[PDB]
Amino acid sequence: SMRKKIFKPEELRQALMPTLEALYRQDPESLPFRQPVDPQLLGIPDYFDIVKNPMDLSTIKRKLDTGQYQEPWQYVDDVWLMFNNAWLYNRKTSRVYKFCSKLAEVFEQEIDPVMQSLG
């Protein structure tokens, strides 16, 4: 039977970096997401009462550039984890919530065709 494809880091990078660059270019919308959450500096000391698995753009980038991803779905799941964290922690009337809803719309649009074309 057909086995699960493991990818060359170089192919994963060359196929998925663009969808990540599309998020990063949105400014200010990507600013909330660029850097691991510091609950002290951001003045949100209850952050980890609500979020339990942190994730950010800088973490996804390093994972991609040091080939820690073997399958493209691991990348996709990490992006959605970062967005689901934001939707869960922040109010619907907040900028981080609204920035999240907007970077999600961009991502769905970049990523859905890329995944058609990968094994």
Ligand X SMILES: COc1ccc2c(c1)N(CCC/C=C/c1cccc3c1N[C@H](C)CC(=O)N3)CCC2
Q: After which residues is the chain broken (C to N over 2.5 A)?
A: none
Separation of alpha carbons 34 and 31, rounded Å? 5
50 contributes a contact to ligand X by CB under 6 A? no
- Does residue number 33 form part of the binding site for ligand X (CB under 6 A)? yes
| Residue 99: both structure tokens together | 């920035």
> Is 55 among the residues that bind ligand X (CB under 6 A)?
no
Distance (Å) of CA 33 to CA 17, 49, 78, 115 = 16, 19, 12, 23
CB of 21 to ligand X, least distance (A): 19
Contact region with ligand X (CB under 6 A), list: 12-20, 40-48, 68-76, 106-114: 40-48
Q: What is the token pair recorded at 114?
A: 């890329």
Distance CA 56, CA 60 (A): 6
Question: 6, 10, 27, 43: which one contacts ligand X (CB under 6 A)?
Answer: 43
Residue 44 binds ligand X, judged by CB under 6 A:
yes
Q: How many residues bind ligand X (CB under 6 A)?
A: 11
The pattern of x and - marking residues 90 through 119 that bind ligand X according to CB under 6 A reads x-----x-----------------------
